[PDB]
Symmetry: D2
């Protein structure tokens, strides 16, 4: 039957009724409140708005952060003051339907695997290059959350010893080098070096280096703005090298690369592929994983969380 | 019934008859020949010597390097001139029993999982710190070789961007920092800096920095030789940080740490655990994997390869 | 004749009358105000208090940050909102004596060279390991400020590509790894990993990892607190490696190592020397610079700034 | 009067008679012998051939490696089996003229300073990007060799902790990332990743990745060969970042960038300048050193060594 998926974003919370083929029949969005306590009411309002006129059987919620193996508790969220938050219990009490809580990128990975670019593969690794960096693991046709629920924290593998401080509390995390926030750092540092090579980029914002935002960088790079282009290339080197490490770890059939950074398309995916090939160990002797574009865009987590709510 | 496991080492090739409980009933060793072509005859002689007086049903061979998903072909070996070597076919033709070929550290991981420190866990990651660095993945009670057979090449994940050249052809591999060869580099660099702090260490060899070997370092560290101790501590920082990254990737119940480097025991395992805890992301909020000592020692690959020969 | 030296610190501003032999005859301290504009009045009050009863001929002011080659303008200060601040002019107008403005670590280097550990050498490099990391260059018996006044910004050479964000605006600076702030980071990360090994350290503060301060670390390490000791050793590796790079650049007779971090004495200087020796390139073939303890302590900048006020 | 300069290269030894204006009046080249003992006879034959028809007063010899402060002994050479080699004595005995021995890049720096791009500056840092990476320091109009003769070993400052093994015996040296040998590594790694983007480059050699040589890379990049271009850009990032560190150390009026790598001209110098600007700490507040093209090409060391033979 029909289930609801919920995507908890930094700015908006979206809930959608999703059918068994992963099709979204309704979508209702609410503002993400500044408060943790408010976020629960907002999730419930989003679910109510999406649910109108549909026979809904379960609710799946995708949340950034470490979710336990019981798919019930957010152990830690990077942008919400949730610490061992019993989200499943609180929402079930309020909506009166079964609820599953999943990591956001796990949910997106399952969405891409079941309904997107992963179809036809048995073993795939999905990566989301967004504001944060996440991913999900599919092995033998099943999402793998690990013993304690916290597998596929790809954003927090250390790629630079003694590197940048990260929101997770550690240093040198992949997310500090291959996420949208890294993209903005590269553009700012490059625009500061040579502002004449960033005319288009700076024109799209307020004209200062401080004013550069992620949205500007994609549009400027498309136009051939040298700083914006070079910034994507710098990000692509980190993203491709990290995929190469994941190939040595998991050796999947395919990688599915998604998230806001990947949205510009081949401008960023092509250099990611080139770096993957450069750093793939034993690439002369072993088969190369396919590096595939995600197909569901920003809807992958909503669809995936709804479908994960069925498995149970 | 009984099967034979084969361990192909840099100096010796050992074959052993192994029962269903993982018990080794016979062991026959032959010198590893300098030639690739010779290695096949030697494998066959080792199998014949071990097999005498036992009803053997199958042969499992563990080999360093990338083994395909058909468990038949060595795609690349780091110390043997094998490139797409059809090892299974060549040995089956000669011994007249079914043969499986597995990566050496996959075999050791399966041995530890089935008969050693992994018993009672469903999801474990095994690491071998030896001359090279390898490992194996157990997820949902099954060894995971990946789509193309080449998963768990842990030694070749990049831990240092722009780092040391590695035998795999790449740079900055974990094996360059956490293997026995790294241990020797640290000891040499430290003994060169302060030879007065390496009296015991240098006394165990020929007295020169060039003469320092791995065997010396373990014995000297035990005696409290400062250089030898500090060298293990340096290796332990890399080994523990790498385990922390693997926890973010796989989130297993336990890590099993084995190989020649780990043989000294708590002298090295305790600092590995301390570094693991230091670098475990979200360690305040998530459960900590157990870091367990391997139980089968150098016999794990032989036992594991024999048992893998049953599954089929 | 007599001159006054001024040390502008984060908490206190000290002025002292200094004779031709570098002897401090009077010292007057004032609180560092929270405001940039206030800092000028405070400098003048400190000078007035120190000057009472002495015939003072000139004033030398040591300031953290980039000072121009005219020894007049603070181009940028890391802890004061000074940007192209005409400090010399403002103070001369108010005190009615000639004023020179020098970088703080340049002043300390000249103090150590003329009156401290540098006496008898012609070519010495001084390093200050304090809250920030600074230094000074003496070549052919003269302080070398560079063409634009900004030489010997040792704290901001990049030792880690893609490393930690620094207060200077860049990444991977030596100051992020070898200063007192790095010491505190290492202790916190280590105390978080193994709080049982930091009992003494945590007892000296409020008992939490957050409460660990620099002062605690020195006292705990002295007592053999493992975390505190290991934290100094980690800092010493960065400090010694950086000295080794400076030897390849400047090849001085001696390094003089001072600042608050170095105050514990051989506990930190001995490991710094060991790391220097480890990383000194061509150390087998070339003479080794002496690594000397500073002699003037926290008074070096005051004495040096007073004496620099004479040269002119 | 007239002096002779000698350049000891990996393939050829060149000697030239040089006038007081740095003009080369004669040049005689001899093959560099495979043997250290032979190199002395060859130096003498080169001097004799160049000297014919000129009244020569002194001989200056530039040698790669660490030269002592007496300008007499090669303490260590990276490509010749010289260890504490009394080169001055051996040559003086044979040629019967005063001889000075200087580091090769010191000699080139003095040549550029006196007769090339350094004229009009008082404080300049010269860098040579060739097969090896070297440089020289001019401060207050004088070459600075340091206390023991071994200053300005720029090639062996550590830019990557735990980085590539270097011929000097250490790790992570700037020479491993910004020299001609690094250029070749980048091109090979990139051509391996995407051989279709290296058609022109591979066509210039034997068609294999192994066949790629430095000469090919310059010519291919000029034609817009993507791999060759990207390889120069990768080198330029390391070269520019290193210049930025040197600006924090020495704060010179100008950098003079020379050597074989720089010969292609603005194709490489422009990206070096862009990276310099990106990484220059405090670049918003301090004056920027000029980054200048060398003017004397491969003749700088010969001219500089001849002129250094006058000062004495
Ligand atoms: O939101 C994308 C990712 O952000 C990371 O910082 C979090 O640790 C992940 O749990 C999440 O999947
Ligand atoms: O022998 C231990 C390990 O050595 C590594 O260098 C190889 O790549 C692995 O396949 C092997 O498992
Ligand atoms: O105060 C010590 C040092 O701190 C550094 O951060 C500043 O850049 C230097 O100018 C100063 O000498
Ligand atoms: O030849 C250029 C440079 O090569 C480096 O490897 C040597 O250490 C230097 O002494 C020399 O100046
Ligand atoms: K995940
Ligand atoms: K493996
Ligand atoms: K300074
Ligand atoms: K030099
Ligand atoms: Zn992180
Ligand atoms: Zn490798
Ligand atoms: Zn800095
Ligand atoms: Zn080197």
């Amino acid at each position: 039957g029909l289930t609801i998926g919920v995507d908890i974003g930094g700015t908006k919370i979206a809930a959608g009724v999703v059918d068994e083929e992963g099709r979204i029949l309704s979508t209702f969005k609410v503002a993400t409140p500044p408060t943790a306590e408010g976020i629960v009411d907002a999730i419930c309002a989003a679910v109510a708005g999406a649910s109108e006129g549909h026979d809904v059987e379960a609710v799946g919620i995708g949340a950034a952060g470490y979710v336990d193996d019981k798919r019930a508790t957010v152990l830690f969220a990077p942008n919400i003051d949730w610490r061992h938050e019993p989200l499943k219990d609180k929402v079930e009490q309020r909506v009166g339907l079964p609820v599953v809580v999943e990591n956001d990128a796990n949910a997106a990975a399952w969405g891409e695997y079941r309904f997107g670019a992963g179809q036809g593969h048995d073993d795939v690794i999905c990566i989301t290059l967004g504001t944060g960096l996440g991913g999900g693991i599919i092995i033998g046709n099943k999402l793998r959350r690990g013993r304690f629920g916290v597998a596929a924290e790809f954003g927090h593998i250390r790629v630079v010893p003694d590197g940048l401080l990260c929101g997770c509390g550690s240093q040198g995390c992949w997310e500090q080098y291959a996420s949208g926030r890294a993209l903005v750092r590269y553009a700012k540092q490059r625009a500061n070096a040579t502002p004449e090579n960033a005319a288009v980029l700076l024109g799209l914002g307020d004209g200062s280096v401080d004013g550069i935002e992620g949205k500007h960088i994609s549009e400027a790079a498309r136009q051939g703005d040298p700083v914006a282009v070079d910034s994507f290339r710098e990000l692509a080197r980190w993203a491709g090298a990290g995929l190469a490490d994941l190939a040595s770890l998991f050796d999947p059939s395919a990688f599915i690369v998604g998230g806001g950074v990947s949205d510009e398309g081949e401008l960023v995916l092509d250099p990611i592929r080139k770096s993957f090939r450069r750093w793939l160990i034993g690439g002369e002797w072993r088969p190369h994983a396919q590096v595939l574009a995600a197909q569901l865009g920003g809807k992958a987590g909503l669809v995936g969380a709804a479908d994960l709510a069925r498995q149970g």
